[PDB]
Amino acid sequence: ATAAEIAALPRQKVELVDPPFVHAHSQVAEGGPKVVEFTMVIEEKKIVIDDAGTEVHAMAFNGTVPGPLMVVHQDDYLELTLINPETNTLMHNIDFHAATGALGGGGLTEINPGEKTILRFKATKPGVFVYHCAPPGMVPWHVVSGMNGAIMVLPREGLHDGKGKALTYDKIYYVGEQDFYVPRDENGKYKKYEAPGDAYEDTVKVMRTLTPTHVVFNGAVGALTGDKAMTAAVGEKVLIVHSQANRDTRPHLIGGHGDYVWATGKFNTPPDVDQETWFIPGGAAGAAFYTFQQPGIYAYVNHNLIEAFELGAAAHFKVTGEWNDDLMTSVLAPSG
Amino acid sequence: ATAAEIAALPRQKVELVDPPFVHAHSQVAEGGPKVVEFTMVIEEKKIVIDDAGTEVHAMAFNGTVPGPLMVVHQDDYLELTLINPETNTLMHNIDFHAATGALGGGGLTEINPGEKTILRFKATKPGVFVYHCAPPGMVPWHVVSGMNGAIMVLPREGLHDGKGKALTYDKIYYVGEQDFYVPRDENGKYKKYEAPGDAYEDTVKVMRTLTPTHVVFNGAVGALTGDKAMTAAVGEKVLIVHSQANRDTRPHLIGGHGDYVWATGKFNTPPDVDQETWFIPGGAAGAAFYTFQQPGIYAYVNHNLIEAFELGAAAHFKVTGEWNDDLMTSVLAPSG
Amino acid sequence: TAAEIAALPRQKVELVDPPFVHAHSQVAEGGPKVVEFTMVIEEKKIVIDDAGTEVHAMAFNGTVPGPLMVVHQDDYLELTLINPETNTLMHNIDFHAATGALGGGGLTEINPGEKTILRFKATKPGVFVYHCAPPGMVPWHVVSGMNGAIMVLPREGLHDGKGKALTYDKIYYVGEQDFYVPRDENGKYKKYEAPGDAYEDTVKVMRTLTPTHVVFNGAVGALTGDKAMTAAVGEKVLIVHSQANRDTRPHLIGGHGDYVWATGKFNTPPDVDQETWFIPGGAAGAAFYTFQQPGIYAYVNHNLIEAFELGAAAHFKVTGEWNDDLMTSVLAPSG
Numbered sequence A, B: 001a002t003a004a005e006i007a008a009l010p011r012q013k014v015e016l017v018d019p020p021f022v023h024a025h026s027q028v029a030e031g032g033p034k035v036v037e038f039t040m041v042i043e044e045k046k047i048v049i050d051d052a053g054t055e056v057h058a059m060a061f062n063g064t065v066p067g068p069l070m071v072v073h074q075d076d077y078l079e080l081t082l083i084n085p086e087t088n089t090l091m092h093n094i095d096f097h098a099a100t101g102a103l104g105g106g107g108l109t110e111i112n113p114g115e116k117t118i119l120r121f122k123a124t125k126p127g128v129f130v131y132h133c134a135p136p137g138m139v140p141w142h143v144v145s146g147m148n149g150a151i152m153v154l155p156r157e158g159l160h161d162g163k164g165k166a167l168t169y170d171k172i173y174y175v176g177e178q179d180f181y182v183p184r185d186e187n188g189k190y191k192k193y194e195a196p197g198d199a200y201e202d203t204v205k206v207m208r209t210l211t212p213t214h215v216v217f218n219g220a221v222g223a224l225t226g227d228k229a230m231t232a233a234v235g236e237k238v239l240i241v242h243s244q245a246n247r248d249t250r251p252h253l254i255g256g257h258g259d260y261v262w263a264t265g266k267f268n269t270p271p272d273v274d275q276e277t278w279f280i281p282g283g284a285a286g287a288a289f290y291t292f293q294q295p296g297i298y299a300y301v302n303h304n305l306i307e308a309f310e311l312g313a314a315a316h317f318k319v320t321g322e323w324n325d326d327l328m329t330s331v332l333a334p335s336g
Numbered sequence C: 001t002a003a004e005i006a007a008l009p010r011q012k013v014e015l016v017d018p019p020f021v022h023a024h025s026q027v028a029e030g031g032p033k034v035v036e037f038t039m040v041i042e043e044k045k046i047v048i049d050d051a052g053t054e055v056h057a058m059a060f061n062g063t064v065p066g067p068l069m070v071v072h073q074d075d076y077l078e079l080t081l082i083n084p085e086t087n088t089l090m091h092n093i094d095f096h097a098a099t100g101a102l103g104g105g106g107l108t109e110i111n112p113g114e115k116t117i118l119r120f121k122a123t124k125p126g127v128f129v130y131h132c133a134p135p136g137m138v139p140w141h142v143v144s145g146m147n148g149a150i151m152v153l154p155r156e157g158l159h160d161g162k163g164k165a166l167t168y169d170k171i172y173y174v175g176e177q178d179f180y181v182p183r184d185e186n187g188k189y190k191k192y193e194a195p196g197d198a199y200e201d202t203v204k205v206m207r208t209l210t211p212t213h214v215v216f217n218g219a220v221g222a223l224t225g226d227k228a229m230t231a232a233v234g235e236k237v238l239i240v241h242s243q244a245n246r247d248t249r250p251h252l253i254g255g256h257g258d259y260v261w262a263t264g265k266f267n268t269p270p271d272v273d274q275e276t277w278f279i280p281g282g283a284a285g286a287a288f289y290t291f292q293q294p295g296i297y298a299y300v301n302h303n304l305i306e307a308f309e310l311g312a313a314a315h316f317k318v319t320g321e322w323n324d325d326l327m328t329s330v331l332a333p334s335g
């Protein structure tokens, strides 16, 4: 498209919401290509990541870890206003894996505290894609401080299975998985700091072990449980978008499956089916579609079970509805 | 199906066999859906995992690590009687990744020492799938103590390639891969413990390093070598089912290939072909089909070669038959 | 038949050092051939980082990785492998592309002062790892750099999943190496007189499963700066990537993998529109991309600690016209 053609396209302003929720959207595109406008303010802030009060100096798009999910359709333009307030200490930028050119946008969006920028790119490829900050010379430090999220570029006709039949979800959730590398003192207690830069050298030492101290969803151990358990009902179709900007993960719905899984996250690559555990490499997003068939509590985990149940990578679903004894029944309950 | 309909189905009792062997079965289903009955007794038992005499307090379905392979067909019911003898010390349960509801069955099968339970589930999806114990709050400790195996749910019409041509194996082996996390003393020698509980705290410390001390097939370094090497012949079609309940692996047949590999383990997901090294994420099973073409000794490994050759993840095949100089020949033997 | 195999033409090919690739045609020229290559093994000290850190490299053809050999399906690859008398260790070669004798390793064990010639039929199309594998010291040779890859092209060249031809303008081979360099009690990397002197200390590092360095083309920054790979807007590039011991997850920063044979095997349909692909340890993969924007790209293992702390980052320098439709700065960084 020419500059004039793009200038004539309709604009739509979107209001972002905090993960694991996703902002309002339509699965099938409403009308032709649009310039979809988003704004995010970067917040450097302390987050508490476990029940021992361990702290991370988060670098948080829109104030959350992960940053929020942006949803557009293929061949829309995504136009992001990114703001780095004067209250922050570091330069930041943004790299969209969905975008083409200038290091995904990072080369055009380096903003010091007190600066803003507006980047537009054409969403040419359908899928879920990571975005993350990447300041030259400081790239993994910002990413493993939580400065990452994802977008979804839906096909204009919505999702389809590998034989071209529509797949339409009732609910969508976005699970951002984060590896953290928290320094410890000589007695094994996690260290606290009173500015992000003060933690840099100690954190790099831990990073270089390639062994996270914490692996968490939505920024903290237990975050997506209790008050933040995800919900569904028997018969409901749910899309679970999962990202990991730095490190591999292997998602698994305990008690369920991934009926269709775009494990690479790219919708023109046919989905795997009937999955027990899928695999998303560091630096990518993936998506799983499931229809719930049983009520009750489910756990949703990274299925390195040490990562899930020692290091923090476990969420819950609470599902309502009627139990199906054909699918599963206790013929003899635990007894002497 | 209604309760009355399920009650009218034929029952078939199966006698399990120890890995890497697989109990007798038919690739193509014989007759309509059946309730296929299995029994396993859980044994907490000391095992030796290397030639030095290193011990683990294993938690072993049917007394083996891995637990045995159960084989059914799609839309059969798997009915397991699980027994936790009074000689054991811990509560145990079972989660079938093939099943739907109640955390794969774990929520319905929590049995204390001196208890049993019977779980029935409908095997709705074709593939190989992990099963493992998962007591709330103690999940990875049981799994990495060996309390895991796999099942195979064959399509009722047997296996096919991605384009609908039948694939019929001559024999099948089940390789369960186990990551162990054995504590060491200040001399760097592995520790021994009187009861399983005494090892817990020390073992969790090793687990949290995400670095196993041992990575083994069939419960020990070298378990599938010597007189326990797997066997085949030139022309023979072999299915190798491989599981890893906790941690990634990358199987490879040294001197061979995976002609067809269901790397995700799910038979409705078309197999990859001509594979050198395939990838099975922690929490999953996969399956590879190969027709042997050359005689001699092969090694079957996890192709992180440190894991294979330092940590234990290497098996052997002995293969009979005639050497094929078209496929490979030594034109000049090592010489001055 | 025996006479048919003996009657096939034999063709010698001159190798080139990675990341470049020797002369070849994408579509096969003529019928099956026995394609002859020669490599000399070099044991030598290399410096792998900006601090003067040394590895005793074990290098096919003198490079880490060893060079890419290119044949077509149903050709034969006939390698003369030479272990000069100045070396100290026995070596061999395992081709993952080959069938039998542990990929060739069982037939090619050569002591210093020996050579051998191995022929195998390249029956399966794809990119495949090759590596040294002396029994009982396999990972040590591999993680000392003694690995590379081959490409077995389909006789009709590459195609997408719908049978449309994919023809590259250029090809690069990125071999990724995990190194495990011992350190003294003060954290300084150790140096050794002879390769064997480092064996025990190195195995201790290996068993941590944590590399000290993860590099392309044998050193931190080997494919950056003035050694960046190059392309132009509109150019179609195939990037072959291998890792003989350890997983990797390649990513072109600012680009994509338009078609990715992530398993490396061309009869397995390629994934499309990839952000980051995954190659397990012990395998090669290949990605096809048409460049659409000029400028500097990074190409990384997208464990960004591995990329930007441990060494696994390369660059492409791309010429041509910027496309504002694909991306534009609506408002440059400003107050």
Ligand SMILES: O=N[O-]
Pocket (backbone or CB within 6 Å): A252, A253, A254, A255, A301, A303, A305, B095, B097, B104, B134
């Ligand atoms: O599926 N239980 O980890």
Ligand SMILES: O=N[O-]
Pocket (backbone or CB within 6 Å): B252, B253, B254, B255, B303, B305, C094, C096, C102, C103, C133
């Ligand atoms: O294929 N030898 O690891």
Ligand SMILES: O=N[O-]
Pocket (backbone or CB within 6 Å): A095, A097, A104, A134, C251, C252, C253, C254, C302, C304
């Ligand atoms: O795609 N930036 O690592």
Ligand SMILES: [Cu+2]
Pocket (backbone or CB within 6 Å): A059, A091, A092, A093, A133, A134, A135, A142, A147
């Ligand atoms: Cu930042």
Ligand SMILES: [Cu+2]
Pocket (backbone or CB within 6 Å): A095, A097, A132, A283, C251, C253, C302
């Ligand atoms: Cu990135």
Ligand SMILES: [Cu+2]
Pocket (backbone or CB within 6 Å): B059, B091, B092, B093, B133, B134, B135, B142, B147
């Ligand atoms: Cu148990």
Ligand SMILES: [Cu+2]
Pocket (backbone or CB within 6 Å): A252, A254, A303, B095, B097, B132, B283
């Ligand atoms: Cu599980």
Ligand SMILES: [Cu+2]
Pocket (backbone or CB within 6 Å): C058, C090, C091, C092, C132, C133, C134, C141, C146
């Ligand atoms: Cu060697």
Ligand SMILES: [Cu+2]
Pocket (backbone or CB within 6 Å): B254, B303, C094, C096, C131, C282
């Ligand atoms: Cu190998």
